[PDB]
Amino acid sequence: LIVTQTMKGLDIQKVAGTWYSLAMAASDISLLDAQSAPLRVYVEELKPTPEGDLEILLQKWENDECAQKKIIAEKTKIPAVFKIDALNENKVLVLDTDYKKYLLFCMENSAEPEQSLVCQCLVRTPEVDDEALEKFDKALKALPMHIRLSFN
Amino acid sequence: LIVTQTMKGLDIQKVAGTWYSLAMAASDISLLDAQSAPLRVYVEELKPTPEGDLEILLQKWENDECAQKKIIAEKTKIPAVFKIDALNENKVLVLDTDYKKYLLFCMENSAEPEQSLVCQCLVRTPEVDDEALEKFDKALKALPMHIRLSFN
């Protein structure tokens, strides 16, 4: 990705609260194949820290169960871009959000060979409005996604 | 599906030969989730019979292997629609084909509750032309697909 593809003027504090993963897409099918997929996670809550970092509560399938995992995405010099400084480095990129209805973001695996990207369309409530899905579609047209999922 | 959504004037004998599954889509994510998916099969060859029936050679993942399975789709009173008269009945619907480059078809699970549909975009050769993918997209717009896959 590029800086021109991330959001400008993002205020991390306003994304706080609950979210629902409405749709996902990835540049490689295996990234989201069967539940056990490492990047196939569902965002449940975003908790910005007073430090400007981003705490992410996620639910993932684990042994017939729905396991909760909390990861911390650290701010970087680039706004809208956060780093999960784990053994395996991943970046969280915020593409766009209106704070009150939707949020679009991607997770990238820099270590991997070519661009390994997985993006999600999040919404505040399961309301019957498709502006979020439309925006998601708009932002994904520029990227080479090989798999696309939509939750009911 | 409806009769107006299937192909008119299809000549089953002309689809004979090898094909490659280029893209798939389904009305329900679970239908194509992880390799083990029952409708996640790759068409390798179509063999029409002198009787007008359709023999389909498919490859599917099975125990770390790529298993070959041959199914027979029997003609019905409706052209372009074939029935796999197994314990679990499934129908094969041919949406459109130009015989020499692409073929679009769906497999439906009538027994299941709501419409359980899985469609595929097949091509004769892996040539660098996207008319097949475009047509596939065009035909899927009318259907409610929740997952979409594209092979490299």
Side-chain angles (χ1 to χ4, degrees), chain A residues 106-122:
Chain A
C106 310
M107 284 199 252
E108 183 193 69
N109 308 291
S110 60
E112 279 258 32
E114 293 307 308
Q115 267 214 301
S116 181
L117 193 72
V118 176
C119 313
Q120 288 192 28
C121 168
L122 308 185

Side-chain angles (χ1 to χ4, degrees), chain A residues 3 17 28 43 50 52:
Chain A
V3 310
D28 194 75
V43 183

Side-chain angles (χ1 to χ4, degrees), chain A residues 97-147:
Chain A
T97 179
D98 69 344
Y99 303 117
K100 60 180 183 181
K101 175 154 64 178
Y102 70 98
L103 183 157
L104 309 181
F105 83 94
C106 310
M107 284 199 252
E108 183 193 69
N109 308 291
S110 60
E112 279 258 32
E114 293 307 308
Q115 267 214 301
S116 181
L117 193 72
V118 176
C119 313
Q120 288 192 28
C121 168
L122 308 185
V123 295
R124 289 291 196 172
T125 67
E127 75 184 312
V128 300
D129 159 52
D130 59 31
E131 157 173 39
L133 292 171
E134 288 303 318
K135 297 285 187 70
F136 188 57
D137 265 82
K138 265 215 303 172
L140 295 178
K141 73 200 305 179
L143 311 172
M145 300 298 99
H146 285 288
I147 177 166

Side-chain angles (χ1 to χ4, degrees), chain A residues 33-34 40 146-148 150, chain B residues 33-34 40 146-148 150:
Chain A
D33 230 318
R40 182 153 173 179
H146 285 288
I147 177 166
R148 176 66 166 299
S150 256
Chain B
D33 230 318
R40 182 153 173 179
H146 285 288
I147 177 166
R148 176 66 166 299
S150 256

Side-chain angles (χ1 to χ4, degrees), chain A residues 70-105:
Chain A
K70 187 199 291 198
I71 63 173
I72 300 174
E74 292 173 54
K75 60 186 169 300
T76 65
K77 280 298 218 306
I78 304 172
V81 178
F82 300 76
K83 178 184 296 77
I84 300 177
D85 203 52
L87 294 183
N88 301 300
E89 281 184 291
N90 285 70
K91 288 178 177 175
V92 177
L93 309 294
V94 182
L95 298 183
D96 179 39
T97 179
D98 69 344
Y99 303 117
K100 60 180 183 181
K101 175 154 64 178
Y102 70 98
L103 183 157
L104 309 181
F105 83 94

Side-chain angles (χ1 to χ4, degrees), chain A residues 32-60:
Chain A
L32 297 169
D33 230 318
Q35 299 173 174
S36 55
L39 290 182
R40 182 153 173 179
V41 293
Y42 313 101
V43 183
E44 194 180 313
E45 211 187 320
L46 293 186
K47 347 269 267 61
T49 66
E51 331 311 299
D53 294 322
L54 182 71
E55 183 176 310
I56 308 168
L57 281 65
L58 304 159
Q59 44 191 60
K60 177 171 185 174

